[PDB]
Ligand binder design. Structure first.
Ligand SMILES: CN(CC[C@H](N)C(=O)O)C[C@H]1O[C@@H](n2cnc3c(N)ncnc32)[C@H](O)[C@@H]1O
Ligand SMILES: CN(CC[C@H](N)C(=O)O)C[C@H]1O[C@@H](n2cnc3c(N)ncnc32)[C@H](O)[C@@H]1O
Ligand SMILES: CN(CC[C@H](N)C(=O)O)C[C@H]1O[C@@H](n2cnc3c(N)ncnc32)[C@H](O)[C@@H]1O
Ligand SMILES: CN(CC[C@H](N)C(=O)O)C[C@H]1O[C@@H](n2cnc3c(N)ncnc32)[C@H](O)[C@@H]1O
Ligand SMILES: CN(CC[C@H](N)C(=O)O)C[C@H]1O[C@@H](n2cnc3c(N)ncnc32)[C@H](O)[C@@H]1O
Ligand SMILES: CN(CC[C@H](N)C(=O)O)C[C@H]1O[C@@H](n2cnc3c(N)ncnc32)[C@H](O)[C@@H]1O
Ligand SMILES: [Cl-]
Ligand SMILES: [Cl-]
Ligand SMILES: [Cl-]
Ligand SMILES: [Cl-]
Ligand SMILES: [Cl-]
Ligand SMILES: [Cl-]
Ligand SMILES: [Cl-]
Ligand SMILES: [Cl-]
Ligand SMILES: [Cl-]
Ligand SMILES: [Cl-]
Ligand SMILES: [Cl-]
Ligand SMILES: [Cl-]
Lengths: 291, 291, 291, 291, 291, 291
C-alpha cells in the first residue's frame, strides 16, 4: 500500500498523465496513485505550490508527493527529492486532520520529488526538511530522458522507485540549502492598523476570494472571530463584515462573509452564492484588512 | 476489497478532493476510491442528485456512496447516513446492469452518506431505505470539524469509516423519516393529449437534451418505440421525430432523434451532431410531447 | 494486478464513467482502472486514436485498453478486440520508456477493445496485431445492451472480463483484416521541397502546436537538428527557427521553438509561453515547413 | 430651417433610418435631420425616454422630436403628437444650456411625435404639455401604412409634415390626458436614512454608473457636495467617496468619484478609468447610498 | 437641394466616411449627404446590395446613391454609373412610400454609382436602367487615385460631381449590358408543396429572421394572410404559425409570428422578443415553408 | 455654408452628441455638422489624434474641427483654439485630395478647437499653426459650465461661435507654444538596415494592420514599390511580401499584401480577407521592416 500523490501541469485532455501512471505501475506494481490535480496554470510555480503545501497531514506516512511543472524540460537541470520534517497541522485553527482529535503524523515521513525550480518553496518553509538530493541516478531516471517530458522522466519515474522503496539517499548527491531554488514569497505588510496583502487565489468552483493574509497575521493585530472588519479589495471595494467561522454566518443567501478558509487564510465570499464570478474579481488584486 | 464512490462539488482545480482521498486511504487502507464527478454546480442539490441516483446497480455490494454539496457547512447541521433497500433496475428498459442477464444486487447492500440538505431525495424515492442515522459520533467525524470543509469532515471521513467496517447504527441516533430533508420534485403535467415537463439536463459533452418525462409517463400515455411525436422546447422550438431506441435511427448525421436515454427518460438529440450547443438550449426550458 | 486503461468521449461532468468503472470492479475485483482521458471531441475517431496509440510501451504487460467513442451505439455493430503485436518504441528519438535504458515489452502483451469504427486505425498500423475478434458473447456483453450506452455495454464491460482472464478468442468469431474498419490518415505531401501537412493538435494546456509531420518525414527530406526552418500555419502566419530538442533551446521566455514532440512529430511553441492561444491557432490548419 | 431630431430602435446596420430620412427630405426639402441615437434596446420604453427627455433646451425653437420604439406596429394603435410646455432647465445644477448665462427657450416651442405606448412619459412629466393629438390624418400618414414599419409610417413621415409647418391640431382629434399611455417609474425609497434606488444606466463608452437618485432626492435627505457617501451596487459591491462635482475631484487615475451627472442624477465612476466594464455592472442593479 | 445617399463598408470607427463627405461638400456645396449605413460585412456584395435595392422610392427625384464595397480597389477596374428606370413600389403590399396614396416617382429619376463588382445586381433587376457608363473622366475622378481608397476616389468623389450637375453621359464611355458585373441570385426552389429557400438576413437589432422567399413566391403557391404554415430553419428547427401582417398578431409577447417584412419577404420573429439571438440563428441557414 | 467637423469620445448610444449638435444649430443656424466619429477609446489622446490629423485637405477652407476627449472635464483647464498653417497633402504618395490634380487648399484656412490635453499634438506638428488661443470668453463658453460635459461646454459650443464668424482672437488670450500640451510621439528607430516601430492601429472593419513606419521612413532606407520586404509583427511573425500599391497585388484572395495605406504608412493585410481578426493581432505590437 504505498501511495504516490501526483500534481502536474499536464492537464487531463490527453494521455500525458496516463503515460506517467503506466510507468508508476510498471515500477511499483502495488502503488496507489492519487491525483492531486493537473489543471494548474503551466509554469506558475507559486500556484502549483498552493496545491501541494497542505497535503502531508491528510496522507498516511510514507506517501510520496510527485509534484511538477517543468518549463526547463530537456535541459541539464535535475529534480530535487526532499524528505520533509514536520507533517504540519493546518486549517483555520491549526490542527491535525481526521476524525476524533485527528491523525497525528510523525516527522520525516513524506518525500517530495519536484523540479528544482522553486515549486517546493512553501513546502520547505512550512514543513522544513531533513535531507535533500539531486535526482541523477540512472537507476531512477532514464539514461536518455525525453527532452520535452521531464515531468515523466524526472518526477513520475523516480517517484515510483521511491514508492517501491528505493533509498532516497541513492538518487544522487546531497543538495546544500542554497542549491535548492526558491521563489520570492511577498510578505503581508503591516501598514498602521491595517494588514496589507493580496488576493492569492479565486476558490473555484465557488468564486470565493482567498487572500495571503494568514490567521497568524490577524492574531498579531488581535483580530479574531466577531471582529468587525473592513476588507478592501482591488483598492475600491471596502467590504464590511465581522470575521465569522463560516459562510452561513452572513445570514441570508448572497450576503458577504469574511472568514478563515480551510488553509488558514483570511478570505471573503458570499453565502451560497458567488462573490468573484459576477464581478470578475481576480488573483493578484490588492487585499487590505483592518478593524 | 471495499469501494467508496465520491461525488462532490469540490471541483478538480485544486487539492480539495485529494485531501479527502488521503484521509479515506488513511482510515480504510484497503479501499478503492472511485470518482463519480466533482463538477456539479455548487449548492444545486437537484443536479447533484441526478449524478448519484442511478449508481447502485453498477457497483459491488457493500459500496459506500459519499455524495456532497455542502452550503450549510460549519453550522449545527449533521450528515445523514442511509442503507438503501432496493438497488433498483434502470436504463431505458428497466434491467440489471452488466454482462449476460445483468448483475442482480441483494437488498440493503449500499450506503449513502450525505449532507441532510435534500441531496438524497431521489435516492430514497427510487431505492427506498432500511435505516437512516444522523452522523455525530467523534469516532467517525472530527471533534473540531473545519467550519468551511464539511464535505470532508462530515462526508468523506465518516464514509471511510463505514468502508472500514464501522457499524452503520453507531454513527449517531436514528433519524425518523420527517427528519430527512427532501427537495420538491415538480410532476409531469398532463395537458389534454400532451405530456408537459422540463429540460432536466443538457447531456454533456454531446449536447443531447434530457427531459423529466419518464418512460413510465410515456407508456401510460400509450407511447412506445415507433410513435410519431412533436416535442416542443422553450415554448417556441418544436421538433418532430418517431420515438426510436438510439441516435443512428434518425438516419443521416445531424438528423433529429427522439429517444429514451440510458436513465429511462425521454430525450432529443441529433445523430452524431450536437443539438443543445448550436441553439444554446438549456436546462429549465419547458418540454412538451404528444403523439 | 490487472490494469484497464480507459479512454472515452463520456466526459467527467456526470456519472457515466463511474458507472463503467463500477461494472469493471464488479467483474474484476482485482482491477486497477487508469483514466487516459474522457475529454475527447465526441465522435472524432482520429482525435481518439491520438490519445491511445502511444500508450502500450508505458504500461505493465497484460494491460487492457478500453478505448471508445461510439456514435453507432444501439445498432447491429459489434466491438472489435485485438491483441497487438509490437509494443513499439516512441518519443522524439524512438526509445523504450522508463528508467535506465528503458523497459522492453514482450510482443503480444496488450489488448485493445474498441468500437469497430476506425478508432484503432493507428494502433493497428503502428503496433500490428496477432489476433482480432468480434465481441458478441453474452459471457462478456449484456444479452440486452443499453441502446445509447455501447461504450459501457460493448467496451467497458467486456474489457473487465478480459482483464479478469477471460480468453480473448472466446469473445466472438475471428475478424479478417478487411472487416476491421479504418480511417484514411492524409499523407504529408511535398510541394517542391517544402513539407505540407496539417496541425494535428493544439497541445493543451500549454498551447503548443503539433503537426502531422513525423521525424521520419523530416529525415527523408534531409532535415536534422539545427536546420533553420520556416514554418507557416493556416497559410498566412509564418514562424522561423532552428530545429531543436526542446523549448528552452529558444532562449528568452516567449521565443519560438521548433522541435520534435514526445510523440515524435514536428511541433512549434513559444518557450514557457503559449503559442496557440493568443493567435487562436487550431487543429486542422495547414502546416508547411521549409529549410 | 426646420429641424427633426430623430431617436429610434432601428439600428444603424441596414437602410431603415435612411428610408425614414429620405421621406423626411421628400416632405420637408428645407429640413435638417439630427440623429439622437438608434441603438436603444428594442421595445424598452424607459430606456428610450431617457434619450429624449433632456433634449429640448439644447435645440432651436420649433424643433420636432421624432421618437420611436413601436412594438405595437401594424395594430389599430395610432401615434400621439404633443406640444410640450416648459423647455425645462437641466444639468447637475438646473440651468439653461449654451454660452454666457445660457439660452432661454420660449414655452410651447417643441413638438414630440411618438407611439402612444408610454415613451413620452418623462417628457410629459418634466415638460408638461399644452396640446396632445391622435395622429390619424391621411394628410400626414399613409392611407395604407406598412404593417411592420410604423416607426416610419406613424412617426417619421408625420414628423416631416410637422417640420414643414402642417398644423399640429389637424393631425387628428385631441387626446385627453388619460388616453396618453404612461409607464410607472419606480420611486426612490427610504430604508431608514439610506436612499434605495436603482442603476438606471451604464454610461457608455466610459462605463460610468448612473442611478435614478436625483439631485432633489439628495437635497431632501440633506446630502450635499462634500458629504462622505457609501454607495453599494447590486446588493454586494460597496464604494466610498465624498460627493463631488466631477471625476478629477477623485485624484489619482482610477479612484472612485461619486458625483452628479450632466442629467442631474447621482452617479459613480472611476476617474478616467471604467467602473462598470471590469465589474460587469448592469442597468437594473440596486443602488443604495448612505452618509 | 441635391442629396447623396452613401452606403459603404468603411465603418464608423475612424475618419474614412468624413473624408468622403468633406470632398462631397467641397464638390457640391448645396448637397445633403444622407448616411445609409457603413457597417456591412466588407467585400460582401450580396449584403451590400440588400441595403441599397429598396431605397429609390423613399428619396426625392434626382438623388444619387453612392454605394461601395471595393475589394478591387487600386486595380484597373472602374466604377459604373447608372440611371435606373422604374423607382419601383415595394413593401409587403407593393405600393409607393409616403403619406396619403404615397409619393409616385417619375421614371429615370435616380442614379447609382458603384464599383463594377456586382453590387448593383438587384438594383438593375428590380429597377431596370436607361443608361450605364464607365467612370473614367478626370473631371469626376482623381488623376492619381489613392490605390487603397477607391470607395472615395471612384465613388464618393464622382457621386458629388453628379449631385453637382455633371452630365451623366460624360463620366466615361457607355457600358453594354454584358460589361456590367452581376452576382448569381439562388432561386427559390419548389419541393412538392414546400417552398425551399434561405435565411437571407438576421433583422438587427431585433433578431427577426428574413428569408429570400418573396410575397410573389407565396401568392403563386396560393399562400396569403391567414394561412397556417410550417417554416423550418437550419433543417432541424421547425416553427408553426398562421401568416399574419404583423408581430402583435402572434398574441402574447414572445409568441412566434410568421409575416411579410417591410421589403416584401417571408419572415419569422417573436412578438416583442428576439428569435435569432437566443438560438444563434444565422444568415445562410435553409428555410422551408408549406401550408 | 459653414462646416463643423465633430470628433468626440461621446459614443452614439445616447443623446450626448445630439445635445452638442442642438447647440451648434442654436448658435450657427446655417451650419452643416459633419461627424468624424464618436467611437474612439475614451481618454486615449493618441488615437483621437489619428482621426483628426488627415482631415483638412478633404474639407472646404474655413471648416472648423471640433475635436474632443476631455478626461479633465470640470477642472480649471480651458480648451485651445488654433488656426493651422499648411492644410497639408496626404496619402501613399503625398497629394491633394479630389478629382483631377486634387483640390489645393490655402494656408491658414482651418481652425481646430480641442481640450488642451495633447489631442492636437500631431495636427500641430504636421500642419504647423499661425495662432493659438485659450478658450475663456463667456461669449463663446458658459459662465457656469456643466462640470462633467466640457466636450459640449468647452468644444462644441465655442466651435459653433467660430463657425458663425466669432473672431478667433477674441475667445481668450494668445497661448505661447510651451503652454500647448503635447504628448510624446515615439520615434521609428533605425536599427542596422531595419526600421523598427509599432503597430499603430487595426484598420477596422477590415482587420488590416497599420504601422507607424511612414513612407518617409521607408524612402530614407530606399524602400519603394517592388522591394522584397520582411515585415516582422509581434517579434515572431516574419511576413514576407514585396511592397505593392494595393491589396489585390498579393494575387489570390487571402494572400499577404504589404503596402502604403491611404494615410501614408507602411501596412500589412490579406487580399479581401482579414489579417488581424483571425489571429487577434493588436495595436502596440512590435513592427519591424527590412530588405
Ligand atoms: C469549500 N469546500 C472546500 C474546498 C475548498 N477549495 C477549500 O480548500 O477549502 C467545501 C464545501 O463548502 C461549500 N461552500 C463553499 N463555498 C461556499 C459558499 N460561499 N457558501 C456556502 N457554501 C460554500 C461547498 O458546497 C463545498 O462542498
Ligand atoms: C451517450 N454515451 C453515454 C453517456 C450519457 N451521458 C448517458 O448517461 O447515457 C454513450 C455513447 O453514445 C454516443 N453518443 C452520445 N450522443 C450521441 C449522439 N447525439 N449521436 C450519436 N452518438 C452519440 C457517445 O459517443 C458515447 O460514447
Ligand atoms: C510537455 N509536457 C508533456 C505533455 C505533452 N502533452 C506531451 O504529450 O508531450 C511535459 C512538461 O513540459 C513543459 N512544457 C510544455 N510546454 C512548454 C513550453 N511551451 N515551454 C516550456 N515548457 C513547456 C510542461 O511544464 C510539462 O511539465
Ligand atoms: C461625459 N461626457 C458627456 C456624455 C455623457 N454620456 C453625459 O450624458 O453626461 C463628456 C466628457 O466627459 C469625459 N468623461 C466621461 N467619463 C469620464 C471619466 N470616468 N473620467 C474622466 N472623464 C470622463 C469624456 O472624456 C467626455 O469627453
Ligand atoms: C480601405 N478603405 C479605406 C478606409 C481605410 N480605413 C483608410 O483610411 O484607408 C477603402 C476600401 O478598401 C477596400 N479594402 C479594404 N481592405 C481591403 C483588403 N484587405 N482587401 C481588399 N479590399 C480591401 C474596402 O472594400 C473599402 O471599400
Ligand atoms: C421593424 N422596424 C423596421 C426596420 C426593419 N429592419 C425593416 O427594415 O422592416 C420597425 C419597428 O418594428 C418594431 N419591431 C421589430 N421587430 C419586432 C418584433 N419582433 N416584435 C415587435 N415589434 C418589433 C420595432 O420596434 C421598430 O420600431
Ligand atoms: Cl455558482
Ligand atoms: Cl475575464
Ligand atoms: Cl471499530
Ligand atoms: Cl449563453
Ligand atoms: Cl442491435
Ligand atoms: Cl475562436
Ligand atoms: Cl390597422
Ligand atoms: Cl456579462
Ligand atoms: Cl461642368
Ligand atoms: Cl456564435
Ligand atoms: Cl472580414
Ligand atoms: Cl481578444
Amino acid at each position: 500500500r504505498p501511495i504516490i500523490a501526483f500534481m502536474s501541469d499536464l492537464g487531463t485532455t490527453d494521455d500525458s498523465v496516463a503515460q506517467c501512471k503506466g510507468l508508476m505501475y510498471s515500477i511499483c506494481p502495488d502503488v496507489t496513485v492519487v491525483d492531486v490535480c493537473h489543471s494548474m496554470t503551466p509554469w506558475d510555480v507559486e500556484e502549483g505550490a498552493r496545491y501541494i503545501v497542505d497535503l502531508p497531514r491528510f496522507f498516511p506516512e510514507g506517501t510520496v508527493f510527485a509534484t511538477t511543472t517543468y518549463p526547463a524540460t530537456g535541459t541539464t537541470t535535475r529534480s530535487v527529492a526532499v524528505r520533509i520534517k514536520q507533517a504540519a497541522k493546518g486549517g483555520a485553527r491549526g490542527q491535525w486532520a481526521g476524525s476524533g482529535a485527528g491523525f497525528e503524523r510523525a516527522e520525516g515521513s513524506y518525500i517530495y520529488i519536484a523540479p528544482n525550480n522553486g515549486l517546493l518553496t512553501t513546502v520547505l518553509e512550512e514543513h522544513g526538511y531533513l535531507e535533500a538530493y539531486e535526482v541523477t541516478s540512472p537507476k531512477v531516471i532514464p539514461e536518455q530522458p525525453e527532452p520535452t517530458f521531464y515531468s515523466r522522466e524526472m518526477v513520475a519515474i523516480p517517484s515510483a522507485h521511491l514508492a517501491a522503496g528505493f533509498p532516497l539517499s541513492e538518487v544522487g548527491r546531497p543538495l546544500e540549502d542554497h542549491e535548492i531554488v526558491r521563489f520570492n514569497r511577498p510578505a503581508v505588510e503591516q501598514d498602521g492598523e491595517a494588514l496589507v496583502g493580496v488576493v492569492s487565489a479565486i476558490d473555484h468552483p465557488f468564486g470565493n476570494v482567498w487572500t495571503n493574509i494568514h490567521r497568524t497575521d490577524l492574531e498579531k493585530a488581535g483580530i479574531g472571530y466577531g471582529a468587525r472588519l473592513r476588507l478592501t479589495l482591488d483598492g475600491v471595494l471596502p467590504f464590511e463584515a465581522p470575521l465569522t467561522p463560516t459562510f452561513a454566518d452572513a445570514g441570508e443567501i448572497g450576503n458577504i462573509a469574511i472568514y478563515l478558509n480551510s488553509r488558514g487564510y483570511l478570505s471573503i465570499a458570499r453565502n451560497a452564492a458567488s462573490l468573484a464570478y459576477p464581478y470578475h474579481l481576480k488573483e493578484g488584486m490588492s487585499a487590505r484588512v483592518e478593524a
